[model samples]
Target: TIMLPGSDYNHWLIVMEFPKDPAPSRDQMIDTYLNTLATVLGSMEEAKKNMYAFSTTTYTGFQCTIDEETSEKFKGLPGVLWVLPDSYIDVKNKDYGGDKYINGEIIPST
Candidate 1:
């Protein structure tokens, strides 16, 4: 089970393939992602408003609140694997292991 500190309400998770060799540092990676989002949203401020969790350890990509029409635009972006709409998880009586769910795998932070 993965815990992203807080919630990602109404957001879409964008999974991407790990960067090729010479990958950027975590901060640079996030800034680059935000830049891309800004281009799509037409404003950096709007991109910030839609931004959410960023999977920087053991995986790549981040989350944002965008409509299906907008999400479709990312599918063709470099390295982007897929975009999935947020889903509900019931945590009422469950003591799950601490693992971050990224893409289709359960990855524990390193």
Candidate 2:
């Protein structure tokens, strides 16, 4: 999922899960994955500037800007299971204009 910090800074976080079948070797997987990320991020000037953090399952973390278009390119990759939109997220204590609370906790709207 993609997430921006406070709607001001365009910090994006990409989270993806690969299927268990056809799983490449651990090292090969990491190499291919990171290389793909680097290629994508390297292409975007804006995303390269605003990039903050990136990571995969127990492999490593990355921080750098990656253009939105380049980010979209990952959809064509072979091992990718799904690509979630960065806009969808759950905010704590942020009212959605309902009588019920967000996550079972009542929060006052400003």
Tell me, by lDDT, which candidate is best. Answer: 1
Residue 42's C-alpha lDDT in candidate 1? 92
| Deviation from native of the Cα of residue 30 in model 2, angstroms | 2.5
Model 2 TM-score is 0.38
Put down candidate 1 lDDT per residue, 1-110, tens digits, no spaces: 66343234345677766556977686676766677788789988877666655666645776677877888888788767878765433345321222343332435433
Q: Which ten residues in a row have the lowest lDDT in candidate 1?
A: 95-104
Please give the clash total of every predicted structure, in order.
0, 7
TM-score of each: 0.65, 0.38
Clashing pairs in 2: 2-86, 47-65, 47-66, 48-65, 48-66, 51-64, 51-65
Runs in model 2 deviating more than 4 A are 1-11, 19-26, 38-64, 82-110
Off by over 4 Å in 1: 1-10, 88-110
